[PDB]
Design a protein around this ligand. Structure first.
Ligand SMILES: Nc1ncnc2c1ncn2[C@@H]1O[C@H](COP(=O)(O)OP(=O)(O)OP(=O)(O)O)[C@@H](O)[C@H]1O
Ligand SMILES: Nc1ncnc2c1ncn2[C@@H]1O[C@H](COP(=O)(O)OP(=O)(O)OP(=O)(O)O)[C@@H](O)[C@H]1O
Ligand SMILES: Nc1ncnc2c1ncn2[C@@H]1O[C@H](COP(=O)(O)OP(=O)(O)OP(=O)(O)O)[C@@H](O)[C@H]1O
Ligand SMILES: Nc1ncnc2c1ncn2[C@@H]1O[C@H](COP(=O)(O)OP(=O)(O)OP(=O)(O)O)[C@@H](O)[C@H]1O
Ligand SMILES: Nc1ncnc2c1ncn2[C@@H]1O[C@H](COP(=O)(O)OP(=O)(O)OP(=O)(O)O)[C@@H](O)[C@H]1O
Ligand SMILES: [Mg+2]
Ligand SMILES: [Mg+2]
Ligand SMILES: [Mg+2]
Ligand SMILES: [Mg+2]
Ligand SMILES: [Mg+2]
Ligand SMILES: [Mg+2]
Lengths: 491, 74, 62, 506
């Protein structure tokens, strides 16, 4: 074998996108982290997937959790381990100790195990092996140097054998040593760290491939998720810039608006409506989500500010009946507090819900409601993920941004998502004769020509009624205009 | 190598031996040391640093979920 | 000799600039870093380039 | 000198100033620091200098480096310790352990060593002594209390012997303990600390004297660089404010300006030219450097924004041929990325180049270039340097500063260097009728009278042209003025009809 390194795929959604193929075969990969990070789960999902997708039987070596329990649990992702053991496809090699015993049995057993293990491998023609918390073993009474030699013996034996392993390790500090005895680190070929980062009373699991001897991979931490369908990672960087782009057009829900953008919204595009609280974005959305129903197309509305019932209210008050849209199963509403999760969990609920309703349109009411509390970068990373997924999937996107300062605003968006979007529809308050009058404007349309005027516009039980511009005013943008009333030429 | 059961001083004299002999032979060498904190000591035992005539440090700084590789000639 | 030290070129793209010539001849150089920084590589690349560019065989202790 | 302690001169550049004379005679100075901090140079150089300038034979004790190596390395700077060891002016005493050793030997060897050192000094009649890395000695198997006692002994025997020693030491953390065992700090008479602060990927070395039992000295960290000449410290705080001041005048390369300047810049003055990007500070400097050459003087240009090549294209397009300027051996251009070194370094490169050429005029294009990323307190401290040097050297200076915001800048400099400079020439854009026009202003001159007018100026192939002010304009500094007219049409040369000629004849 005189070729590059060969990698086996884990099938763990996203792990292989980052490990450029996955764990290198015949070698041991180290996946350590703190208590509650997925390690165990990972190893399992490793074997399982291997069995159910390539009939590669597997050996699972547990030094603490009991077989009955490793199974009991797995049923949490809808996995009947018991069966794979009946089918001789998975062998749970119990290595835990019993409530009674002796001592002074250091490496005495590290030599028997390697024999009980090679046993199950050969015997079950195993290709994948996962050793859970190898740490809990020398957690009998050992020091660094002692551990280094035992591991090296193990891995070595396993590399001789030819099995591809994954070793579970426990850490105590999220950013401190890689493994409890800062020794494993160098005893392994590959290293994967699972982190459960606090930061704000909110946690955020992130996975990282520190190293892959002999092959390349992706650097840095990647957010992931532990669900009923196991560990789901999102290589928000992996995503390529190869999204389909068509000239097809779509209605905005507002004829005059469609006219302004010169023919409408491109089917393949991201639309951003920015306005100081009260300018009626949530209106445009409602309207934009109704039009994808009169055309019997499916559409989801992700509101993060208002309730299910309230939306219905304010909706029926503008005409549009959302009651129907529900029944006709063409419109599906979500609603969730940004505080009921993290941007990682959210992005998934979105993506996920998209796949089960196959939307042709999607509206997220208040992106900035989602930027509540979270860091800037983390947020962008969130938009790129939703914005993107929506892009390469042919789903027209309309997201709502509520700037932090009514009147005067010197920038479309505070988070600077500007460049991340195709068409910018900007609403703004204008102070005329001591009254707070609205105005709408197509700031930028990438493909189309769109109108350049800043048009007045009111709201009634009929919805948005766009009017004329303020042709005879100065500094509109600022919010507090100044009528010109020029003495013509004065004859 | 000294991850058998050693302590600083025993590690110091031992490097010194190695390096030294290799100096006699007239060999231009490159030694590899493993660390535990991107900005902590320069090497596992806090001895190696001073012992060597030339030192090079390769780091993989984390920071903001991205890692950046840097190389420093101490 | 009886002058400043002389260096060996590493051909490791750039590094031979950051050291004003390369590793000093007849001496060791400690290259360290945490797991994954690229030491083993750097050590290999030093050897390889040695051979491949001046026919200066090398020894690799592992 | 009023100091109860008689000091000895190191001759290391500026250390003496910092130590108010140099090491105390008959005592020991702990020079400690991490790895690659300068320890061994300092020590070596300390003996060397005593040998070359005072014929004070010296003993050098090494515990790790080999006697062959201390010589080999020492050539790096240009010293032949070999020869000195030959004339018996420098005895190197080897105490490194062997490549084929044993274990145990650090107490009766400390006694044997003292007895050894006494010998060498007695035999060579030495007055200076170094001891490199005593630390590595107890680095066999010891603890705090055993070191203190073993140090004390050595130091005490040394002082009885009457020797002016220097001990080097290692530390782990740049800012934590002073030494390793945390006991060297209190058994030494003096403690000199060397640091190599990382901070933002670059590396800055400083030298600090924590204590001198018995005298005053300069408190705090001071920058220094290691070069082909050894250590070199800059007493950026010892630099007294007693620079010479004359009333002589020197052109600015541009006449009108000169007028505006009461009659041409002061020979002894720091000149500051601020303005938005594109205002033409660069231009002005070019003329200022040129003019010195047109009059047969030497002047250097340090450019941190433009290549030496481009600096010439633009310089020619503005007339003035810099090529010749390089040839006639009057103008010397530098060029250096500010990211290609720290401030301590750039400061010295400049100084050096200022010596090997004796300019009469100096012009640093874009100090705000050097301000990139550095901490203001570190930058302000750089400015003070270059500036100071130039003042106490009778070398006129023309510094450049580019403001982060074009039009609307409410401050001369974003680094508030304002008060360091003596004269300020301002440049800015003026939105006059859908057009960006340049305006030049002489904001302040310390010794002269200077015009208080914000003249408009246009840039051409010939260069700078200084017209007149926008008298009929309010909110000029706003960048985008407002035009109020109580007149305009007023005289100046009314008389209508056919006032001109055309290309044919007049
Ligand atoms: N069905 C599920 N839905 C959502 N989250 C789940 C589900 N099952 C488990 N989890 C989460 O995944 C984690 C399980 O981690 P697991 O026990 O597999 O290994 P570990 O945390 O890496 O190591 P350790 O053995 O110390 O716990 C739990 O902490 C829990 O929050
Ligand atoms: N029936 C109605 N008749 C007239 N105007 C209405 C009616 N309903 C709502 N409005 C107007 O629309 C506004 C409601 O805002 P909307 O739901 O459109 O979202 P928004 O202004 O973009 O964002 P947010 O609701 O978070 O402030 C009210 O402030 C009001 O001026
Ligand atoms: N072909 C490749 N392309 C891109 N990156 C690679 C390639 N091969 C290896 N790498 C990267 O280099 C790392 C390999 O580390 P390397 O073997 O150079 O030594 P080191 O980390 O300093 O020592 P050690 O890994 O033995 O603890 C991998 O972790 C990976 O990120
Ligand atoms: N000619 C030179 N020009 C510029 N820098 C030099 C020159 N020679 C040596 N250096 C620098 O000076 C340093 C030498 O340090 P030195 O030998 O004086 O003692 P140390 O680092 O304090 O202690 P140790 O001997 O244990 O390393 C090196 O870090 C190197 O970069
Ligand atoms: N030959 C020329 N003719 C007319 N105008 C010129 C000529 N050369 C340069 N200019 C003008 O001068 C400007 C160049 O700026 P200059 O090199 O003088 O330095 P600066 O504006 O102070 O600083 P920087 O170049 O770093 O922005 C141009 O933007 C342009 O308007
Ligand atoms: Mg576990
Ligand atoms: Mg490693
Ligand atoms: Mg290695
Ligand atoms: Mg050192
Ligand atoms: Mg030294
Ligand atoms: Mg310039």
């Amino acid at each position: 074998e005189h070729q590059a390194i060969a990698k086996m795929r884990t099938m763990i959604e996203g792990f292989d996108d980052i490990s450029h193929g996955g764990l290198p075969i015949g070698r041991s990969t180290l996946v350590s982290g703190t208590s509650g990070t997925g390690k165990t789960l990972f190893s399992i999902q490793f074997l399982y997937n291997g069995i159910i997708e390539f009939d590669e039987p597997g050996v699972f070596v547990t030094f603490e959790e009991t077989p009955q329990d490793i199974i009991k649990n797995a049923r949490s992702f809808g996995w009947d381990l018991a069966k794979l053991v009946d089918e001789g496809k998975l062998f749970i090699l119990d290595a835990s100790p019993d409530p009674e015993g002796q001592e002074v049995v250091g490496g005495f057993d590290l030599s028997a195990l390697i024999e009980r293990i090679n046993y199950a491998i050969q015997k079950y023609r195993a290709r994948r092996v996962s050793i859970d918390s190898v740490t809990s073993v020398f957690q009998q009474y050992d020091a660094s140097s002692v551990v280094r030699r035992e591991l090296f013996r193990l891995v070595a034996r396993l590399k001789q054998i030819g099995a591809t392993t994954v070793m579970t390790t426990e850490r105590i500090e999220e950013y401190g040593p890689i493994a409890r005895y800062g020794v494993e680190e160098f005893v392994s070929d590959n290293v994967v760290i699972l982190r459960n980062v606090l930061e704000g009373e909110r946690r955020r699991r992130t996975l990282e491939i520190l190293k892959l001897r002999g092959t390349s991979h992706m650097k840095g931490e990647y957010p992931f998720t532990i669900t009923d369908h196991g560990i789901n990672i999102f290589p928000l960087g992996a995503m390529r810039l190869t999204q389909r782009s068509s000239n097809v057009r779509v209605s905005s829900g507002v004829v005059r608006l469609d006219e302004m953008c010169g023919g409408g919204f491109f089917k393949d595009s991201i639309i951003l409506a920015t306005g100081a609280t009260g300018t009626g974005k949530t209106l445009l959305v409602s309207r934009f989500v109704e039009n994808a129903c009169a055309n019997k197309e499916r559409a989801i509305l992700f509101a993060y500010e208002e309730s299910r019932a309230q939306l219905l209210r304010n909706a029926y008050s503008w005409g549009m009946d959302f009651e129907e849209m529900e029944r006709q199963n063409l419109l599906k509403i979500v609603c969730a507090y940004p505080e009921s999760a993290g941007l990682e969990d959210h992005l998934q609920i979105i993506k996920s819900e998209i796949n089960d309703f196959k939307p042709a349109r999607i509206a997220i009411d208040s992106l900035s409601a989602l930027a509540r509390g979270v860091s800037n970068n983390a947020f962008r990373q969130f938009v790129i993920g939703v914005t993107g997924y929506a892009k390469q999937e042919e789903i027209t996107g309309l997201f709502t941004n509520t700037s932090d300062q009514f009147m005067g605003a010197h920038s479309i968006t505070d988070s600077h998502i500007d460049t991340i979007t195709d068409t910018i529809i900007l609403l703004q308050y204008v102070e005329i004769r001591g009254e707070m009058s609205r105005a709408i404007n197509v700031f930028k349309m990438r493909g189309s020509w769109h109108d350049k005027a800043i048009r007045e516009f009111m709201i009634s039980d009929k919805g948005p009624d766009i009017k004329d511009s303020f042709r005879n005013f100065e500094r509109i943008i600022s919010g507090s205009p100044t009528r010109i009333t020029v003495d013509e030429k004065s004859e």
